[PDB]
């Protein structure tokens, strides 16, 4: 009786919300970008290749200075690369040998990795010894760490295999504020450029919009009908793009609160890993598991490019700030850049 | 000869850690990984004791083998998402407590304890990442088994057996199941033990598992088989 | 970072006299070792240098054949054999920590100094030797070089130390345009070409003493003559 009365209200609810959603739309992006001239047959060639790790890679992380990149593998350590000169700033050894996620400041000074021991530790680069320290581990969550991106020095959000997302203050080492909105595992967060909202993408086929501040969720969005293990914002950060194992993307903004474009073709069977946009926004790149890796213009939703120089499943991408080049990384234990 | 005094310095770091990074790789590469396993209620202890955060690693040595077990036992989410993070692994160590043919899960179900042991074992060994992975599944609790067989019949997880009420032939009936649910039988092999409490044999059977998949792996990889 | 050296002292010519070093507080392995002497009246010369891995070892003409600089990863100690000493060999020498990799700050720590007493390459020359401004009045210290210290790279390899009456030099702006840790925003210059300057602003007590130049794009390390500031 009362479990059928709630549940008939959430459903007049979504109902009301999806009636909202269908009736403020004028025309789709295909429409409005129909004049759009194409981009035209994008080709890149790796100009640098690195060759320094011995497992599988798993995250990569481009710094504020668009030359140094940090990466991790199941080796049990963390790289910090030079993307001009091939060259290793700092070796890492890590702890668990389990990562899957990897973080830079944007001041520069700090790393910080996840991995399944539900423990996110924070590295200094800068220290006054000549060698990197562990400065804080986060151990307040009951699931494996997927993600993690540093708002500032002493505040990073880090999303894990729980329902639960949180922000951390890694002068006092506590959960200042918990995101209990989703209904499954978060696979990867991607912050906003003014850093005070993210978008967090779950397994429940669901993305939802949060707030650093309040800790509230804003909006909520449906496309998607598999797991979604890739999410990325526009650079104005109006809007954001996820992938999924559907063999699909979609691009969600956040004033209109509904898909506007779809990115799926026919020969695509594999899931999407990574995905990242270009300095303005015009070209998108994602990461698929059919060994190559595929370029879409985000106006008109067609092919521009298509990289194969890796040999496995391609678990990263990363776009330099400057957007004078760009990385790749898999489970083949080799990085190229490509331009 | 195009480098500057601090470039020159900065190759030979890079170079020092590439050569660090190698010697660390081929120590990590004389290692046997093994992944331990097991429904709830499996009595894991067993080995875990004989032997002596998310994820638990315990690291113990044996005849100048450096083994490393990596319990998952403690990590509630989707498989899918960690399960590739194993892929490589030497064996993966299962265990399947005996005592759960008459026993319900937490939840009262239709489900037995000893099915839900049979639903986690065809779906590890059916899995696209484990494919050519062994088994040494170790069945505990073998002194309770044979008690309680005899004040219950089996016919309460097994109604279909129609056989002997014994140790052996009850245990032999749910040996076969297990090992009926490999449905690639030519890539995979389970080796299949039971739990000794007051003996040491446990550590034993892994020793001669782990070197005859190593066995059986290094002939693949020099055109023998 | 504690740098203490001793083994030096009052030697007859024609002698040998090892120096050591004891090294702590830091990842002695990790971090490149300097040899760098004054002259009891003034003047800074480079001697010595090794690198990370007990290689890349480099020597000053002037001591070529006679030096000899060996470093001990485990326990630390930095060694440096002298033969053959002369009456040039009366200088006190500093022991220096340097890494270098991109962001890194060489020459980022000098030691106190063992006393000694015995009874192509770019040339830094500045005429300027005093400064008559009073505290709490800008300064301005301007040297100059032989050739452009700027390389195909972008960087100027130009380095500043001030070494105040009874205490070490310490590293103000390393690479022309950075500044060190632990140096007050006060310090800083930039300078093109083979002209440089150091423009110090709010003059305090304590920024006193003699301030030194030297140039890392060529081996062997030059410094210059330095102008004394007075107060």
């Known amino acids: 009786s009362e479990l059928d009365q709630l549940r008939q209200e959430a459903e007049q609810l979504k109902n009301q919300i999806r009636d909202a959603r269908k009736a403020c739309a004028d025309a789709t992006l295909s429409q409005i970008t129909n004049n759009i001239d194409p981009v035209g047959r994008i080709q890149m060639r790796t100009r640098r290749t690195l060759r320094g790790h011995l497992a599988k890679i798993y995250a990569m992380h481009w710094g504020t200075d668009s030359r140094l990149l940090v990466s991790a593998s199941q080796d049990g350590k963390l790289i910090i690369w030079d993307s001009y000169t091939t060259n290793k700033v700092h070796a890492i050894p890590l702890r668990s040998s389990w990562v899957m996620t990897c973080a830079y400041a944007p001041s520069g000074n700090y790393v910080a990795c996840g991995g399944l021991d539900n423990i996110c530790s924070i590295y200094n680069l800068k220290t006054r010894e000549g060698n990197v320290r562990v400065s804080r581990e986060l151990a307040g969550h009951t699931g494996y760490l997927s993600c993690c991106r540093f708002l500032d020095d002493n505040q990073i959000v880090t999303s894990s295999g729980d329902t639960t997302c949180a922000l951390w203050d890694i002068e006092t080492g506590q959960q200042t504020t918990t995101f209990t909105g989703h209904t499954g595992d978060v696979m990867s967060l991607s912050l906003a450029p003014d850093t005070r909202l993210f978008v967090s993408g779950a397994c429940d086929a669901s993305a939802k919009l949060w707030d650093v501040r309040e800790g509230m969720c804003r909006q909520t969005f449906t496309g998607h009908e598999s797991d979604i293990n890739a999410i990325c914002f526009f650079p104005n950060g109006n809007a954001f793009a996820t992938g999924s194992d559907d063999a699909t993307c979609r691009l969600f903004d956040l004033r209109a609160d509904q898909e506007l474009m779809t990115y799926s073709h026919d020969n695509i069977i594999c899931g999407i890993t990574s995905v990242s946009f270009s300095k303005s926004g015009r070209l998108l790149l994602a990461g698929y598991d059919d060994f190559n890796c595929n370029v879409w213009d985000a106006l008109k939703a067609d092919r521009a490019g298509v990289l194969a120089g890796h040999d496995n499943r391609v678990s990263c991408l990363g776009v330099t700030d400057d957007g004078m080049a760009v990385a790749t990384g898999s489970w083949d234990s080799f990085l190229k850049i490509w331009n | 000869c195009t480098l500057s005094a601090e470039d020159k310095a900065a190759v030979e770091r890079s170079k020092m850690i590439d050569r660090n990074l190698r010697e660390d790789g081929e120590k990590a590469a004389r290692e046997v990984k093994l992944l331990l396993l097991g429904a709830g209620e499996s009595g894991k202890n067993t080995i875990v004791k004989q032997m002596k955060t998310g994820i638990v690693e315990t690291h113990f040595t044996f005849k100048d083998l450096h083994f490393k077990m990596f319990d998952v036992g403690a990590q509630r989410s989707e498989r899918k998402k960690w399960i590739h993070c194993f892929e490589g692994v030497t064996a993966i160590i299962f265990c399947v407590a005996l005592s759960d043919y008459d026993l319900v899960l937490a939840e009262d179900e239709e489900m037995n304890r000893m099915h839900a042991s049979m639903k986690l074992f065809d779906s590890i060994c059916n899995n696209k990442w484990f494919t050519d992975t062994s088994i040494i599944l170790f069945l505990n609790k073998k002194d309770l088994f044979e008690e309680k067989i005899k004040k219950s019949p089996l016919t309460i997880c097994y109604p279909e057996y129609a056989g002997s009420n014994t140790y052996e032939e009850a245990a032999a009936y749910i040996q076969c199941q297990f090992e009926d649910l490999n449905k690639r039988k030519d890539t995979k092999e389970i080796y299949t033990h039971f739990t000794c409490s007051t003996d040491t044999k446990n550590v034993q059977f892994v020793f001669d598992a782990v070197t005859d998949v190593i066995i059986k792996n290094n002939l693949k990889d020099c055109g023998l088989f | 970072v504690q740098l203490v050296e001793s083994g030096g002292g009052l030697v007859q010519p024609g002698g040998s006299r090892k120096l050591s070093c004891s090294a702590s507080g830091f990842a002695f392995s990790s971090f490149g070792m300097h040899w760098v002497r004054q002259a009891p009246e003034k003047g800074l010369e480079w001697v010595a240098y090794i690198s990370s891995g007990s290689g890349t070892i480099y020597y000053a003409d002037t001591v070529k054949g006679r030096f000899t600089i060996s470093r001990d990863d485990p326990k630390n100690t930095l060694f440096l054999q002298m033969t053959s000493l002369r009456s040039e060999d009366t200088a006190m020498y500093y022991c220096?920590?340097?890494?270098?990799?991109?962001?890194?700050?060489?020459?980022?720590?000098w030691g106190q100094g063992t006393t000694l007493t015995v009874s192509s390459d770019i040339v830094m020359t500045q005429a300027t030797s005093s400064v008559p401004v009073t505290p709490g009045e800008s300064v301005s210290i301007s040297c100059r070089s032989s050739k452009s210290l700027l390389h195909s790279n972008g960087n100027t390899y130009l380095y500043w130390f001030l070494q105040r009456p009874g205490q070490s030099p310490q590293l103000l702006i390393y690479?022309?345009?950075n500044l060190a840790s632990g140096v007050p925003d006060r310090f800083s210059g930039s300078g093109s070409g083979t002209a440089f300057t150091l423009t110090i602003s709010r003059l305090e007590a304590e920024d006193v003493g003699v301030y030194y130049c030297?140039?890392?794009?060529?081996?062997?390390?030059?410094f210059g003559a330095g102008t004394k500031l007075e107060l």
């Open positions: 690479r022309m345009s």
């Open positions: 030297m140039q890392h794009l060529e081996y062997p390390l030059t």
């Open positions: 220096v920590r340097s890494i270098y990799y991109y962001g890194s700050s060489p020459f980022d720590f």
